[PDB]
Design a protein around this nucleic acid. Structure first.
Lengths: 86, 52, 50, 122, 134, 135, 59
RNA sequence: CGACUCUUAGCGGUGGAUCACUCGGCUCGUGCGUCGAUGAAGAACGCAGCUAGCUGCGAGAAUUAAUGUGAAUUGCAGGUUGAUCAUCGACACUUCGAACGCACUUGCGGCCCCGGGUUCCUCCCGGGGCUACGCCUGUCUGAGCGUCGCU
RNA sequence: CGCUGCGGUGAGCCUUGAAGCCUAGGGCGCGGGCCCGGGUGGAGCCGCCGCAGGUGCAGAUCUUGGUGGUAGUAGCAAAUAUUCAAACGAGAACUUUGAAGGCCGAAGUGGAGAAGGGUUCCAUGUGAACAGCAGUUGAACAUGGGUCAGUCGGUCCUGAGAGAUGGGCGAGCGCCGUUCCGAAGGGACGGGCGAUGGCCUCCGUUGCCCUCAGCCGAUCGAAAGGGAGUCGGGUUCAGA
RNA sequence: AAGGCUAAAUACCGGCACGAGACCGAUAGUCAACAAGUACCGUAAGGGAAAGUUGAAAAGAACUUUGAAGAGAGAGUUCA
RNA sequence: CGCGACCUCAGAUCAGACGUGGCGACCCGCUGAAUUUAAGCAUAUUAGUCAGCGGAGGAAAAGAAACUAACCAGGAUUCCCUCAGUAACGGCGAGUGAACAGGGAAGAGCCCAGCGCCGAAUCCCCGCCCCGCGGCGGGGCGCGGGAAAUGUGGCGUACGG
């Protein structure tokens, strides 16, 4: 009865969508994300899984505010200036 | 691996030996022909031209 | 479930608008290799996680 | 009329708004034409209207900002919008003046023992 | 031989920069030579090809002495459509066969304010090469 | 001292490592003090500390902090080195006077195992094959 | 109407009241399965919605 | 001769080896060596005339301005006083997130200011700005049979 | 002998056809192998002297991919049962309508929900694939549609519990602990003073002083517990 | 000694931007030459593929004919 | 009692600031194994290594001797060659293992406290004036406020002053 018959009683989710990493690993009873440790201020990352690191690092997302820094850097972060008008 | 022994060192006197044997063979027309150089009309094999 | 949260309902909305076939005119583009949508999810086979 | 931003910057403020909602109105009824099965010609116009609304909004925002940073020109404290945003790390560095500060003792060395320009003979 | 260390000679890099060049670079790569009668009139070798330029095809199945204006410059395909250079499709409609600009000689240019200032510059720097060398 | 935080003793290793009780921390209790005062006031910079009293269960230290963004500190050329970003959290990296002593560095034959920057710097340079091009 | 998903019944009521110069009895809203919010706007009896639809173009 | 079975060859299938290609890797080297409370990395959801993914972008949403460039974009439609690309210094940048009014249901507040609502008369509605923790200098208000002084 | 790349060399080969592959063709070598002919193919390749190696397969219950024999075989047998006619249609044991015969038999094969699923709902259209026969049918596919609340739930409350701050511990991320080592109330009434707004009437608003206070553990924790208040009739292809 | 600062020579499998190679050539080389950390699997931590090539140019087979259609027979395109 | 100092200690959505999180190849501080080797194994070895925790920078750390030496003496740190698989450690088994001198790369030195002198001669902030004002700084004027005698600044640090 430990097999097929016992898979019928599975109708209670333990995890749900974490609102910090978006993964479906937010344990409801423990109120902690098993993927990023959401209530903890610091992100959950371990060196014993190099493959899980590169899945979620600084180059995997949009970098919507960092890819602009790389561009502004190659001009010295100039500010308040405009190209000379026509 | 990258730390395979890529480079080799040769004794300095052996390097200088080979350059002497290389130049000395450049003065024999039979050896320069055998290298395939079409030199059948060159006036003199150790060809020397003025510094102009 | 008939009792949903606004997070869940908005999530199911996205996975429903993504389940459509590719439009006919895209493989008339020049550098187009796409033959069909390879991410079509059927509600009975693939169970969307959650 | 192809709305160009060269033509907006000379206008007074509250008439730009009178032109803004005018395009807002025209975009709405263009959206209505999209569901009522409108002509292909009008459907291609909503992109022109959308980018024209962005233009007038851009002029409004720009002219408003430069009026602000002209009002906060000589003031000590200014809103965080108008302070130069450049890589928080270098917002913390010392000024162009502080890093040039030398102690009275260190200044006295430079006056007394300046590095000479010399050359040794063969 | 090239000595500039910052200019690549890699085959894969040159082909990648060629097939992914942006539009304003596509324009330059799609340049065509001028006719002999135009080459000594402007003292200019070649020129990027515009939408309405008289044209002779020199290579290929459509080569000949006919003059034909360009109708469109399909920069995405690295190709131009010349007015009379067309073939019959199956259902009786004609389609413009595409010709590569390098295989095309310009017989008459589409002059305008921006075009003329290009011709003079290509001629101004051309003289520098003959006044500095001689 | 410092007892090994393992549940009920259980150091599942070889007998050389069964120690639980008479283990000593590698850093002084004064260096632990500088760390706790610096971790709480992250905005400040630890400068030094000194002993002010002890008993059977407590040691009391007074840590000297500097606020590196006060103009009295910022505009003074003698002390504006503390403002540089390289001196963020000197106590966490063991650069204060009390912290340096636990690193075992100094000149002479007594301190050979830290020639180089530190104890790890020596270990690297001594356990690195210098595979030259020509060998 | 397909209103924005953020708007209230109060914001929807004063919007149609201002965009089309009409008076509203009540507004019922639901969020469609695709995501956008649909609003049934019941006009006051002194306004005939059939002609109001012709001014805005839907018919 | 049959049928069946076996062998060989031609042809045809099945299958995708081989060969030839290569906008991808791998390795070495060079220069630089720059994230974030002015809201980062990451996540979510949106945005195209016809668009699901990828890519780009943020309600100004496959982008605005500016400058350079100088006639396209293109799958199909539609429409030089600057099309399109590139650059990018102005402007803008939804919701989560160190995440910051309190909670995490998007749920309840509080304060101040405007507009309807009044005709400030309390409401109600909308809008705007605030409302996290630690810590520094300073200010204000305080506490103490702490140490004192004067009445 | 053979494979791959590199330095030399062959005034080498090649769209008048390279590599590769096929071959009842002609041959060479003891052999590893190789050279010709023919066919196919469509763009590169080889000889010689040196150099370099991720260099030669029949096996490893080898790895990946592909294909056989078995084999048109085992099998498509749990829960009594189908029949006639018609319609649509290229096509009907299976769809639809009608009739007949049956079953579930109210602890249902009925009518509604929770959890879970997530568009499967509804309509039109198609018959490639899928629905282990078939299909004119479908929960398949393609287009479109569809979920409306002061009163029904959530929201509020606390439960077992979870969990911040103070504090304590801890190398440290943090942990312990939940009233315990705490200056833990930002409220209220009245009075007094000053001030304003509207017919500064009288009231509201505000500041200051005085007066009072048991609060007592932030916060989270139930779509079955606690919890004010909606019922009748009608209406859709699908919501009441 | 028990207080403090300090460039250069040095390190750099991440990042930005480049160059190169006696390297691999689609079962190789990164897991990933392609809508790849994607599809998919697992409650979760995590695990994790396969998949390059028409032609110079779509010129991608009009039209006739059999069939309900898929599919054929002609014709046509192309050096093929 | 009242009033005022001062010292301790609170509260503020007080005025202005600052810290948190990410990346982590390189770097600094801790923590820290066991496979394995010893043909068994417990010390040793693996190894101050992996994992774990904290903190940075464009480099970090180190660094101007409480040094090396015993010479006729050298003279901050770091890096390379060598010293050297050496001295030494080690069930003296397996194994482990530096330094000085020498040659190079680079080369740069300095500041306090204290001890004393100078009438606090010093610093922060607000208000006004001028100069620039996208690194809010310079000068001036304030019987303007505060810090500071429980010690600010100048001189001066072992090479002596």
């Amino acid at each position: 009865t430990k097999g097929t018959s016992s898979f019928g009683k599975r109708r209670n989710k333990t995890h749900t969508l974490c609102r910090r990493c978006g993964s479906k690993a937010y344990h409801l009873q423990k109120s902690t994300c098993g993927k990023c440790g959401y209530p903890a201020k610091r992100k959950r990352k371990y060196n014993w899984s190099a493959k899980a690191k590169r899945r979620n690092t600084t180059g995997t997302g949009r970098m919507r505010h960092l890819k602009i820094v790389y561009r502004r850097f190659r001009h010295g972060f100039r500010e308040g200036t405009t190209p000379k008008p026509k | 691996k990258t730390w395979r022994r890529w480079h080799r060192r040769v004794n300095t006197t052996q390097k200088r030996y080979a350059i002497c044997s290389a130049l000395a063979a450049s003065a024999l027309p039979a050896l320069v022909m055998s290298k395939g150089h079409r030199i059948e009309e060159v006036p003199e094999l150790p060809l020397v031209v003025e510094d102009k | 479930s008939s009792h949903k949260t606004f997070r869940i309902k908005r999530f199911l909305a996205k996975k429903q608008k993504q389940n459509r076939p590719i439009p006919q005119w895209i493989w008339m583009k020049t550098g187009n290799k796409i033959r069909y949508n390879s991410k079509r999810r059927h509600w009975r086979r693939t169970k969307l996680g959650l | 009329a192809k709305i160009k931003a060269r033509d907006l910057r000379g206008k007074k403020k509250e008439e730009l708004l009178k032109q803004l909602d005018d395009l807002k109105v025209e975009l709405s009824q263009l959206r209505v034409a999209k569901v009522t099965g409108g002509a292909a010609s009008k459907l291609s116009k909503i992109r022109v209207v959308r980018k024209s609304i962005a233009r007038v909004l851009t002029v409004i925002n720009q002219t408003q900002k430069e009026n602000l940073r002209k009002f906060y020109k000589g003031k000590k404290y200014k809103p965080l919008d108008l302070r130069p945003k450049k890589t928080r790390a270098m917002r913390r560095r010392l000024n162009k003046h502080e890093e040039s500060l030398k102690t009275k003792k260190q200044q006295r060395k430079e006056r007394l023992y300046p590095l000479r320009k010399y050359a040794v003979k063969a | 031989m090239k000595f500039n260390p910052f200019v690549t000679s890699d085959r894969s890099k040159n082909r990648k920069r060629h097939f992914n060049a942006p539009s304003h670079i596509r324009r330059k790569i799609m340049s065509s030579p001028l006719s002999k009668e135009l080459r000594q009139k402007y003292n200019v070798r070649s020129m990027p090809i515009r939408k309405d330029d008289e044209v002779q095809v020199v290579r290929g199945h459509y080569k000949g002495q006919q003059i034909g204006k360009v109708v469109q410059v399909y920069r995405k395909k690295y190709v131009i459509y010349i007015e009379r250079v067309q073939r019959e499709k199956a259902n009786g409609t004609t389609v413009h066969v595409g010709i590569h600009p390098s295989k095309v000689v310009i017989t008459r240019l589409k002059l305008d304010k921006d075009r003329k200032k290009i011709l003079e510059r290509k001629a101004k720097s051309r003289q520098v090469g003959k006044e500095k060398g001689k | 001292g410092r007892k090994r935080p393992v549940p009920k003793g259980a150091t599942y290793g070889k007998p050389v490592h069964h120690g639980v009780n008479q283990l000593k921390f590698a850093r002084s209790l004064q260096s632990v003090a500088e760390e706790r005062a610096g971790r709480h006031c992250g905005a400040l910079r630890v400068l030094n500390s000194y002993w002010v009293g002890e008993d059977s269960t407590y040691k009391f230290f007074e840590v000297i902090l500097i606020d590196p963004f006060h103009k009295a500190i910022r505009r003074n050329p003698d002390t504006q080195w503390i403002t540089k970003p390289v001196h963020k959290h000197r106590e966490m990296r063991g650069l204060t006077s009390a912290g340096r002593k636990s690193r075992g560095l100094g000149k002479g034959h007594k301190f050979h195992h830290t020639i180089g920057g530190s104890r790890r710097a020596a270990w690297r340079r001594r356990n690195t094959l210098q595979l030259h091009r020509y060998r | 109407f397909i209103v924005d998903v953020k708007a209230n019944k109060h914001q929807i009521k004063q919007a149609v009241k201002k965009l089309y110069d009409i008076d509203v009895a009540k507004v019922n809203t639901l969020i469609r399965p695709d995501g956008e919010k649909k609003a049934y706007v019941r006009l006051a009896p002194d306004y005939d919605a059939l002609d109001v639809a012709n001014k805005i173009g839907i018919i």
